[PDB]
Design a protein around this ligand. Structure first.
Ligand SMILES: [Mg+2]
Ligand SMILES: [Zn+2]
Ligand SMILES: [Zn+2]
Ligand SMILES: [Zn+2]
Lengths: 49, 46, 49, 115, 476, 404, 82, 263, 67, 51
RNA sequence: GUAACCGGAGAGGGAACCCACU
C-alpha cells in the first residue's frame, strides 16, 4: 500500500463481469481491495491427467 | 441468594449456587441465561 | 490423532450441511446465513482471497 | 445525551416570564416583544393581525434560533398610538375572530348533521 | 469445446485457449482461475431456447437446475484467457440481427450485463445514471447502513450489533436484489424526500429530518454491545464473580455496586449508565482487589440478556449484552443509494415541515446543491420511480441496463395519477402557510441510516487520565 | 475557543470562535466559515481547543478570530463567501423582476441586525407599494461601499455597444454609496474572488462590520428563501425533444467523421502531422472531432436551457456545479480518459470482448454518446467506472505527496 | 538605545496589541489597580481594552533589534492600530 | 383596524375526516389553524409503560413505542383531565391518567397476535379505536407470540399535544390549500399546461390557470382534516380553535400583567 | 420486523392494515387494489404496506429463551 | 512538535445559518466537561460564589 | 465538644494487525 504506482490500482479492462467496477474502498486501498462480481466463479482445480 | 438460571437447550429453571460448574441437571447442556430482573422498569413511549 | 482442523460453516463436513431451514432454526442458526466462514475463539473469520 | 426534553418547547422555567417588553431606541414609538416558549403558530397570526391596523408603521416577528424557544415581535406605531396597545388590540381582535369562527363552525356542523 | 459442453472428460471449470496469430494452444486446469458463465452462440443464434426456459421455469418439480442447463451445452464458464479469444454480444436481440453488419461472427452472449456489478453495487437503483465515484461511495456505505443484519441476532451474543426497528424493501429495486436477499434483510426505509432549500440547515450536503416521523419510529434503531469476562490464573490469585464489599475489597470506584446480584452480575432488564459496574470480579490479594468490568462511559443503555457458561478451560465465563436505542438526532449520518451522504442538520415537527396540497410532509429534505456536481441523476430517477410505484401499487424496477424503462415512460406513468409528470409538487411553507414560489421536487426515496452516530464520536476532556511513559494525555 | 478541521493546510484552518450553547450534540458553525475549514458536513469531525490562560484567550481574540481572518495573505482575497443556498438565493433575489410585499419586507428587515429601524421608500408607490430585492440588499450592504462587478452571464458586446450603463440583462453589478443600484449578485460579486463586494467591504469597513455583513446576508436571504424556494428535479434535466434531435444529429455526424477518418487512416490516405507520428496524429484527429462534438452538444444544451431551470439557477450563481455538468447531465457524458489517452487495449488488440479487434471507433475506446438521463449502455458504464477510478485513485495517492 | 535613535515603527503591531491586552487583563484579573474609571463592567479583558483605548496601560514594550539592541516603547507613546 | 369576519361551510362530514372551507380570513390565521390541528390539540396517549414480563422477540422499548403510538378514544375526557405536570397528586391518579393492563400468554401451537383489543383500560370510555366499526376490520397489532412466549405490562395514559411527541397528534392528514387556481401566483409554474388541475379549481379544460389579479388577497382556505381515530374529525377543529383562543387569552393576560407592573 | 403502528409521514394508522392486506393479497386482488380497498389514498401511507417486509415471522421460527 | 492536549473536544459538525460567523454551537455535554479557570476578583466574587 | 471510622481510593498495561471515518 501507500505506493505512488497507480498502475496496479487502476481498473483493468479484464475486470469485466468478474470484479465489480464500482465497489472498492476509498482509503489507501483503492483498487487493491476489490470484491467479486455476481456470477463470477473461481475455479477450484482438478487433475489434468 | 437463589439466582435461578435458564438452560439454553431445554429452557429449565434450575437452581445453582455460587462457585459451581455451569451444568444443567438434565440434558447436560453447558450454556445458561440468567433471568429477567424483578426491579421496576419505566419506559416512555417516545 | 494429528490435531483438530478448523472447519468452515455450511461446508460439506460442517454440521449445518444440507440441513433444512426448520432444522437451522431449531439449531438457532439463520437460514439466510450464507456461511463460508470459520468460528475460532467464538469469532467469525473470513479468508480474504 | 444532549437531547433537550420534549416539553422544553412550551414550558416556562421557574422565574421565566412569558412575555418581555423592551423599548426600541432606534426609532420612536417602537417596541420589541420577546415571547418565551412560543413559535410561528402565535407569531404569524400576531404579525398578520398587527399589519391590519393602519396606525401600525412596522410589524414583524422572528425566531432567533429554532433550537431555542423564543420569538421577537417588533411593533412600530404612529405617534399618539402605542405599540403596547396596538399589540393588545390585535390580540383582543384575534380572540374575537377565533370565538366567532368557533360559533360559526359549530353551527355549520349542526346544520351539516341532518340538514 | 464439444467435450466441455457435454462434460464427458473435461470439466466445466477447465479453460481451453487457442492463440491464433501466435500458434500456441493452451489448456488451464489449475485452481484460482476466475471465470463467469456465458451463453453459447452458434451461427447467429443462442442455444438457449423456449424449451429450456419453459422446463426451467417449472423448477422445483422438474428439477431442471443450472447444472442441467450446463450439461445441455447451453452455457460455458469463460475465464479471462478464454475471454480474450472470444466474441461476446451484450443482448441477443439487439446484437444478433440483420442490419448494417458489425461482427456477424459472435461466439458467446451475456446473460445480463447487470451481473458485472458486485453485491453492494447491485443494490444501487439506476447505477448507470450516476457518476462512478458516487457508485463507489454507495458501495462503500452499503456496508455501514444499519438493518436486520441476521435473523438470529437475539441468540447471537455479539459486540457492536446494529438493527433497525422498521426496515423496508425499497419501493424501486433492481432485479438483482432478490438474489442478494436484500428484500428479506433490508437496511433502510423508503423515505419521502423533498430536494429543496427550506431553511438552510442542509446547505453543505446536510439534511433536515421530520421530528414527528422520528417520534413515530422513523429510522429508529437499537444498539447492541456485548461485554465478556472470564474468571481464572495463578497459584492463589483466583478470580471470582461476586459483589465486591467495601470493608473486604480495597480498590473500588465511586460507582454503585448494588445493581449487581450476589453472584457478581446484573440481571437482564436493569437500567444502566456510564461508570456502572456490570461484572463484579475480584482477585485474592496475597484482602482482595477487584477487576470488575465497568460499562463504557456515556453508553447509558439497558442490559438485554446475561449468559454464563464454561470456556474450553472449564472456568466460569460470562457474556452480557446491553440494549441502547438510538433515536435519530441531528448529526447522525444518513445516506441514499447514490453516494449522497449527509448528517441531520435540524429536525422540524410536522407543523414546521412543508406540505403538499394533501398533508404529505417530507420525511427528509436535502439540499438541491448536492445534485449538480455529484450528478446523481439516478437519485432523481429513483425519487420519480418511487412515487410512480407507490401510486401504482407495483414495486419499481431499476435494473441498470433495462432499456425498457426511461424518464419519459416514468413521467408519462406518473402523469396518470394526478401529479406533475416530472415529480415536482407545490409545497406550502410550514411556518407562514404561503405556497413556495418554486415547485418542490418530492417523492419516496430509499435512504439508509449509517452506523456513524454522533453519540459514538462526541467526547471532550479537562485534565483526565495520563499516559505512563510520558505524562501526556491519553489517546482515544 | 479556537476551532479547526484537522487537515490544517493554512492559517485559515485554525480560527477563533465565540461559544454559543445549543441543545443537541453537534458542533454548529456558520456556512461561510465552511469554506476556510474545507468542511462538508457529510460526517466531518472538528476538534475544539479552549485557551485556558486569560492571556492566550485575549491573544486568540486579537489574532485568530474569524472576522479578523476574512482576507488571506496567500492570494490577497477573502476566504469566506456566500455559499450553497444563500448565493443562489441572492442571485434570484437581486434579479430585476423581484418584488416584495409590505409584510414580506417587514419580515425580511426583522432579520437585519444592522438596521436602523427605518423602512426605505419602496421602489413603487402606486398602484400598490412594492419593494425590490436590490432595495433590501442596499440596506444589507454596510456603510458607504463603492464597487463595480460583472455578473456571470454578462455579454461581451454589451460594454462596447449602447445600453452600457443601462443593462438590459441587469448585469454589471454597481454598488454606490453603500447602495446596490443595478446588477445581479453572483459568485463573482459575493464570493471569494479578488475585488469582490465582500472584499471591498472588509477593506473599507471593519472586520466586525464585515462579520455583521455575512450574518445579515445569510439570515435575511435564507428567510426570503422560505418564500422563494429552490430545488432540483428530473424535469430540470430534460430537453425540448428538438434539442434531443439536434444532439443526436451532432453525434451521428461526429461518428461519421470519425469513421471516415478511420477509413483514410486505413487506406493510407492520412498524412502524418509534422512533429507527430501516424498513430498520434490519428489520435489527435479523433480527439478533436469528439471534443468538438461534445462542445457543440453542450452549447446546444445551454441554448435549450430555460430561464426557470434549477441547474442554470445554480451554475449561473456559481454556488455549485459548472457549465459542463449540465452538458454531461443532458446532452453527452463525454469521452472517458485514462492517463489522458482513450481507454487502452486491455485485451488482445481490443478493449472489451464485445468489440471487434482493432476497433478505434468512439464507442470502442471510451466515448459515451449517451447522457446521464438516457443512461449508459453497459460498455459505456464500465468505461465511465474505469475513468472515474483513475480520479479516485489520484485523490488518495496525491495526499501522501502533498502533505509531505 | 537612546530616545533620539528610535528606528522601529511607531505603530503598535497586532502581536503587541494581543500580548499587551492579554498581560494587562491578566493583571486586572489579579486585582491590579485599574488606570481608567470603569462603568461597572466586570470582565478584565474589556477593562484592558478600555485602558488601551484610553492610552493608560502602565506597560512599555521592549523591541529587540536583530543585532541585539532594544528599544523601550511606551504603550501610550506609539499608535494603536484599531 | 379590527378583526375580520370569517365564514365556514362544511363540504364533507365523516367519522374519518372533515372537509370544509373558511372564507374572509388571513393566510396566517388559516395556517395557524392548520398548525394547531397538528401540534396543539390535546389527546390521550400512553406515556408510562411498565413491563412485568416480555418473552416476545420484540424488546421492551420497542413494545413501549408501539404501545404509545396506539391511539386512544378520548373525545370528552381529554377536556376534563389534567396534565400530569399540573395535577396535585402523586405519580398517577384517575384525574390525570388512565391505567392500561396487558396480560397475554401464547400456549397453543398457533401464533398469537397481540392486538389493541388485548389492552384493558380502567376507564370504559377511554379505550383504543376498536370501539365501533359495524356501519370486520382488524385491530392494531402490537406483537406476535410463539408458543410459550408471553408479555405482561401495566401502562398509564397521559394528556398531551403533538408538540411533545407525534403520538399525541390527533390528525393523520391535514390537507391545506388556498387559491387552487393560481390567481395570486404565489407560486410560478414554468409550464402551467403540465400541471394537473386542483380539486377545488373552477376552470375549463382550455384554461390552465386563473388570470393574475394584483389586488387579490388569500381567502377561501380549503381544509381536509383527517382524524387518526382518537378524536372525532369534527371535534378536532373545535378543540384546536379552543386551544388557540385560550393560548391567545393567556398571552394577553401575561401582557396586561407586565404592562400594569411596568406602569 | 413488524408493521409500524402509524405511517411515518402521514401518521395514519397502518398497524391494523397488514393482516388485512395479506388476506386481500391471498385473493385475486393486486397490491394496487388491496391498498385502496384498505383506504390508502396517499402514497405516503401506501408505501408503508407496499414496501414493508414482515421479519417477525422469521424471528418467531426460533425457540424462545424460556418456557 | 505535536502532542495530546487537555481542554479539547471533538464531535460532528452540522450547519446552522442562525448564528454569526464568529459563533460556534457546542453541546451542553461538551460545555459541562471542559472548564475555564477564572481568577476571583471583588468584581466577580459574588457571581463566582453563586457559580 | 470521643482514639475523624479508611484519607472521596478515579491514572484503567503495552505492542501488533485489521476495518472504517474526513
Ligand atoms: Mg466532508
Ligand atoms: Zn437443560
Ligand atoms: Zn393526578
Ligand atoms: Zn402516510
Amino acid at each position: 500500500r501507500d505506493g505512488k504506482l497507480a498502475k496496479p490500482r487502476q481498473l483493468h479492462n479484464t475486470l469485466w463481469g468478474m470484479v465489480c467496477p464500482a465497489e472498492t474502498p476509498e482509503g489507501h486501498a483503492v483498487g487493491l481491495v476489490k470484491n467479486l462480481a455476481l456470477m463470477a466463479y473461481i475455479s477450484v482445480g482438478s487433475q489434468p491427467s | 441468594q437463589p439466582m435461578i438460571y435458564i438452560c439454553g437447550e431445554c429452557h429449565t429453571e434450575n437452581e445453582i449456587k455460587s462457585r459451581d460448574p455451569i451444568r444443567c441437571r438434565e440434558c447436560g447442556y453447558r450454556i445458561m441465561y440468567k433471568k429477567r430482573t424483578k426491579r421496576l422498569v419505566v419506559f416512555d413511549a417516545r | 490423532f494429528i490435531g483438530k482442523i478448523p472447519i468452515m460453516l455450511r461446508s460439506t463436513y460442517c454440521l449445518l450441511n444440507g440441513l433444512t431451514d426448520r432444522d437451522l432454526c431449531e439449531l438457532n442458526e439463520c437460514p439466510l446465513d450464507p456461511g463460508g466462514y470459520f468460528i475460532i475463539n467464538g469469532s467469525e473469520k473470513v479468508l480474504i482471497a | 445525551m444532549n437531547a433537550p426534553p420534549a416539553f422544553e418547547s412550551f414550558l416556562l422555567f421557574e422565574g421565566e416570564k412569558k412575555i418581555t417588553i423592551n423599548k426600541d431606541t432606534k426609532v420612536p414609538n417602537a417596541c420589541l416583544f420577546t415571547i418565551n416558549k412560543e413559535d410561528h403558530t402565535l407569531g404569524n397570526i400576531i404579525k398578520s393581525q398587527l399589519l391590519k391596523d393602519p396606525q401600525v408603521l412596522f410589524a414583524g416577528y422572528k425566531v432567533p434560533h429554532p433550537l431555542e424557544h423564543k420569538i421577537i415581535i417588533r411593533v412600530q406605531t404612529t405617534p399618539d398610538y402605542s405599540p403596547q396597545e396596538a399589540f393588545t388590540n390585535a390580540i383582543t381582535d384575534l380572540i374575537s375572530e377565533l370565538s366567532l369562527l368557533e360559533e360559526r363552525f359549530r353551527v355549520a356542523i349542526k346544520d351539516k348533521q341532518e340538514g | 469445446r464439444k467435450l466441455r459442453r457435454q462434460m464427458d472428460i473435461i470439466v466445466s471449470e477447465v479453460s481451453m485457449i487457442r492463440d491464433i496469430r501466435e500458434r500456441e494452444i493452451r489448456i488451464y486446469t489449475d485452481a484460482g482461475r476466475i471465470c463467469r458463465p456465458l451463453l453459447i452462440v452458434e451461427k447467429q443464434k443462442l442455444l438457449l431456447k423456449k424449451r429450456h426456459i419453459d422446463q426451467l421455469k417449472e423448477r422445483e418439480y422438474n428439477n431442471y437446475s443450472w447444472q442441467d442447463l450446463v450439461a445441455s451445452g447451453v452455457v460455458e464458464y469463460i475465464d479471462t484467457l478464454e475471454e480474450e479469444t472470444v466474441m461476446l454480444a451484450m443482448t441477443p436481440d439487439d446484437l444478433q440481427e440483420k442490419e448494417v453488419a458489425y461482427c456477424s461472427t459472435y461466439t458467446h452472449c451475456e446473460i445480463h450485463p447487470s451481473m458485472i456489478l458486485g453485491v453492494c453495487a447491485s443494490i444501487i437503483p439506476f447505477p448507470d445514471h450516476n457518476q462512478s465515484p458516487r457508485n463507489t461511495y454507495q458501495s462503500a456505505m452499503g456496508k455501514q447502513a444499519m438493518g436486520v443484519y441476521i435473523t438470529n441476532f437475539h441468540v447471537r451474543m455479539d459486540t457492536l450489533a446494529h438493527v433497525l426497528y422498521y426496515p423496508q424493501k425499497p419501493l424501486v429495486t433492481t432485479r438483482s436484489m432478490e438474489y442478494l436477499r436484500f428484500r428479506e434483510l433490508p437496511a433502510g426505509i423508503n423515505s419521502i424526500v423533498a430536494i429543496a432549500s427550506y431553511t438552510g440547515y442542509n446547505q453543505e450536503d446536510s439534511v433536515i429530518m421530520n421530528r414527528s416521523a422520528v417520534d413515530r419510529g422513523f429510522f429508529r434503531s437499537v444498539f447492541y454491545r456485548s461485554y465478556k469476562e472470564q474468571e481464572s490464573k495463578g497459584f492463589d490469585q483466583e478470580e471470582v464473580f461476586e459483589k465486591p464489599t467495601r470493608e473486604t475489597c480495597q480498590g473500588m470506584r465511586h460507582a454503585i455496586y448494588d445493581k449487581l446480584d450476589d453472584d457478581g452480575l446484573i440481571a437482564p432488564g436493569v437500567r444502566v449508565s456510564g461508570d456502572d459496574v456490570i461484572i463484579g470480579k475480584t482477585v485474592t490479594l496475597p484482602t482482595k482487589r477487584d477487576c470488575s468490568t465497568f460499562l463504557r462511559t456515556s453508553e447509558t443503555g439497558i442490559v438485554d440478556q446475561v449468559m454464563v457458561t464454561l470456556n474450553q478451560e472449564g472456568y466460569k465465563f460470562c457474556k452480557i449484552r446491553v440494549r441502547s436505542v438510538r433515536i435519530p438526532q441531528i448529526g447522525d449520518k444518513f445516506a441514499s443509494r447514490h453516494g449522497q451522504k449527509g448528517t441531520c442538520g435540524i429536525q422540524y415537527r410536522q407543523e414546521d415541515m412543508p406540505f403538499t396540497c394533501e398533508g404529505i410532509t417530507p420525511d427528509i429534505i436535502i439540499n438541491p446543491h448536492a445534485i449538480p456536481s455529484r450528478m446523481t441523476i439516478g437519485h432523481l430517477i429513483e425519487c420519480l420511480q418511487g412515487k410512480v410505484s407507490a401510486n401504482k401499487g407495483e414495486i419499481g424496477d431499476a435494473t441498470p441496463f433495462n432499456d425498457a424503462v426511461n424518464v419519459q415512460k416514468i413521467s408519462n406513468l406518473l402523469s396518470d395519477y394526478g401529479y406533475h409528470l416530472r415529480g415536482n409538487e407545490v409545497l406550502y411553507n410550514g411556518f407562514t402557510g404561503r405556497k413556495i414560489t418554486s415547485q418542490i421536487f418530492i417523492g419516496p426515496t430509499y435512504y439508509q441510516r449509517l452506523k456513524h452516530m454522533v453519540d459514538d464520536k462526541i467526547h471532550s476532556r479537562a485534565r483526565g487520565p495520563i499516559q505512563i511513559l510520558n505524562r501526556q494525555p491519553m489517546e482515544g | 475557543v479556537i476551532f479547526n478541521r484537522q487537515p490544517t493546510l493554512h492559517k485559515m484552518s485554525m480560527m477563533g470562535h465565540r461559544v454559543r450553547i445549543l441543545p443537541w450534540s453537534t458542533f454548529r458553525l456558520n456556512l461561510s466559515v465552511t469554506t476556510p475549514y474545507n468542511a462538508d458536513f457529510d460526517g466531518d469531525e472538528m476538534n475544539l481547543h479552549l485557551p485556558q490562560s486569560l492571556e492566550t484567550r485575549a491573544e486568540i481574540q486579537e489574532l485568530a478570530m474569524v472576522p479578523r481572518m476574512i482576507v488571506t495573505p496567500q492570494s490577497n482575497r477573502p476566504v469566506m463567501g456566500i455559499v450553497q443556498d444563500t448565493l443562489t438565493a441572492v442571485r434570484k433575489f437581486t434579479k430585476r423582476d423581484v418584488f416584495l410585499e409590505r409584510g414580506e419586507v417587514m419580515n425580511l428587515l426583522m432579520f437585519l441586525s444592522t438596521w436602523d429601524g427605518k423602512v426605505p421608500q419602496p421602489a413603487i408607490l402606486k398602484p400598490r407599494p412594492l419593494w425590490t430585492g436590490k432595495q433590501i440588499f442596499s440596506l444589507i450592504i454596510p456603510g458607504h461601499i463603492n464597487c463595480i462587478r460583472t455578473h456571470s452571464t454578462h455579454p461581451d458586446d454589451e460594454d462596447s455597444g449602447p445600453y452600457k450603463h443601462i443593462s438590459p440583462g441587469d448585469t454589471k453589478v454597481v454598488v454606490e454609496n453603500g447602495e446596490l443600484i443595478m446588477g445581479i449578485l453572483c459568485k463573482k460579486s459575493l464570493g471569494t474572488s479578488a475585488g469582490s463586494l465582500v472584499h471591498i467591504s472588509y477593506l473599507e469597513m471593519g472586520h466586525d462590520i464585515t462579520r455583521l455583513f455575512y450574518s445579515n446576508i445569510q439570515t435575511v436571504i435564507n428567510n426570503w428563501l422560505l418564500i422563494e424556494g429552490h430545488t432540483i428535479g428530473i424535469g430540470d434535466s430534460i430537453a425540448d425533444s428538438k434539442t434531443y434531435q439536434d444532439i443526436q444529429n451532432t453525434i451521428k455526424k461526429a461518428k461519421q467523421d470519425v469513421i471516415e477518418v478511420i477509413e483514410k487512416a486505413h487506406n493510407n490516405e492520412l498524412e502524418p502531422t509534422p512533429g507527430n507520428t501516424l498513430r498520434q496524429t490519428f489520435e489527435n484527429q479523433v480527439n478533436r472531432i469528439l471534443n468538438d462534438a461534445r462542445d457543440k452538444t453542450g452549447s446546444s444544451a445551454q441554448k435549450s436551457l430555460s430561464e426557470y431551470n434549477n441547474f442554470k439557477s445554480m451554475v449561473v450563481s456559481g454556488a455549485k456545479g459548472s457549465k459542463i455538468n449540465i452538458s454531461q447531465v443532458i446532452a453527452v457524458v463525454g469521452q472517458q480518459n485514462v492517463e489522458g489517452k482513450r481507454i487502452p487495449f486491455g485485451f488482445k488488440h481490443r478493449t472489451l470482448p464485445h468489440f471487434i479487434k482493432d476497433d478505434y471507433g468512439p464507442e470502442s475506446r471510451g466515448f459515451v454518446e449517451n447522457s446521464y438521463l438516457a443512461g449508459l449502455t453497459p460498455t459505456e458504464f464500465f468505461f465511465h467506472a474505469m475513468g472515474g477510478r483513475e480520479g479516485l485513485i489520484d485523490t488518495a495517492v496525491k495526499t501522501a505527496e502533498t502533505g509531505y | 538605545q537612546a530616545n533620539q535613535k528610535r528606528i522601529t515603527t511607531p505603530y503598535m503591531t497586532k502581536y503587541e496589541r494581543a500580548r499587551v491586552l492579554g498581560t494587562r487583563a491578566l493583571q486586572i484579573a489579579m486585582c491590579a489597580p485599574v488606570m481608567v474609571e470603569l462603568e461597572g463592567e466586570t470582565d478584565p479583558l474589556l477593562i484592558a481594552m478600555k485602558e488601551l483605548k484610553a492610552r493608560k496601560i502602565p506597560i512599555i514594550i521592549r523591541r529587540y533589534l536583530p543585532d541585539g539592541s532594544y528599544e523601550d516603547w511606551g504603550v501610550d507613546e506609539l499608535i494603536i492600530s484599531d | 383596524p379590527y378583526a375580520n369576519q370569517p365564514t365556514v361551510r362544511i363540504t364533507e362530514l365523516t367519522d374519518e375526516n372533515v372537509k370544509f372551507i373558511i372564507e374572509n380570513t388571513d393566510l396566517a390565521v388559516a395556517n395557524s389553524i392548520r398548525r394547531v390541528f397538528i401540534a396543539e390539540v390535546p389527546i390521550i396517549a400512553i406515556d408510562w409503560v411498565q413491563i412485568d414480563a416480555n418473552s416476545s422477540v420484540l424488546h421492551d422499548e420497542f413494545i413501549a413505542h408501539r404501545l404509545g403510538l396506539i391511539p386512544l378514544t378520548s373525545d370528552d375526557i381529554v377536556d376534563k383531565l389534567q396534565y400530569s405536570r399540573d395535577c396535585t397528586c402523586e405519580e398517577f391518579c384517575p384525574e390525570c391518567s388512565v391505567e392500561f393492563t396487558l396480560d397475554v400468554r401464547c400456549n397453543e401451537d398457533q401464533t398469537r397476535h397481540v392486538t389493541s383489543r388485548d389492552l384493558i383500560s380502567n376507564s370504559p370510555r377511554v379505550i383504543p379505536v376498536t370501539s365501533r366499526n359495524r356501519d370486520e376490520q382488524d385491530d392494531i397489532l402490537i406483537v406476535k407470540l410463539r408458543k410459550g412466549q408471553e408479555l405482561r405490562l401495566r401502562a398509564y395514559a397521559k394528556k398531551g399535544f403533538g408538540k411533545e411527541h407525534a403520538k399525541w397528534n390527533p390528525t393523520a392528514g391535514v390537507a391545506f390549500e388556498y387559491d387552487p387556481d393560481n390567481a395570486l401566483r404565489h407560486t410560478v409554474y414554468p409550464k402551467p399546461e403540465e400541471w394537473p388541475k386542483s380539486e377545488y379549481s373552477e376552470l375549463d379544460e382550455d384554461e390552465s390557470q386563473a388570470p393574475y389579479d394584483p389586488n387579490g388577497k388569500p381567502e377561501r382556505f380549503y381544509y381536509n382534516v383527517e382524524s387518526c381515530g382518537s378524536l372525532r374529525p369534527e371535534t378536532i377543529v373545535l378543540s384546536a380553535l379552543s386551544g388557540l383562543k385560550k393560548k391567545l387569552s393567556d398571552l394577553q393576560t401575561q401582557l396586561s400583567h407586565e404592562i400594569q407592573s411596568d406602569v | 420486523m413488524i408493521i409500524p403502528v402509524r405511517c411515518f409521514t402521514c401518521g395514519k394508522i397502518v398497524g391494523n392494515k397488514w393482516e388485512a392486506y395479506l388476506g386481500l393479497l391471498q385473493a385475486e386482488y393486486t397490491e394496487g387494489d388491496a391498498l385502496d380497498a384498505l383506504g390508502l389514498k396517499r402514497y405516503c401511507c401506501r408505501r408503508m404496506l407496499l414496501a414493508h417486509v414482515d421479519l417477525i415471522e422469521k424471528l418467531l421460527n426460533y425457540a424462545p429463551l424460556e418456557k | 512538535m505535536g502532542k495530546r492536549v487537555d481542554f479539547s473536544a471533538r464531535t460532528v459538525i452540522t450547519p446552522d445559518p442562525n448564528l454569526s460567523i464568529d459563533q460556534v454551537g457546542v453541546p451542553r455535554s461538551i460545555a459541562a466537561n471542559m472548564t475555564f479557570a477564572e481568577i476571583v476578583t471583588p468584581f466577580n466574587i459574588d457571581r463566582l460564589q453563586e457559580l
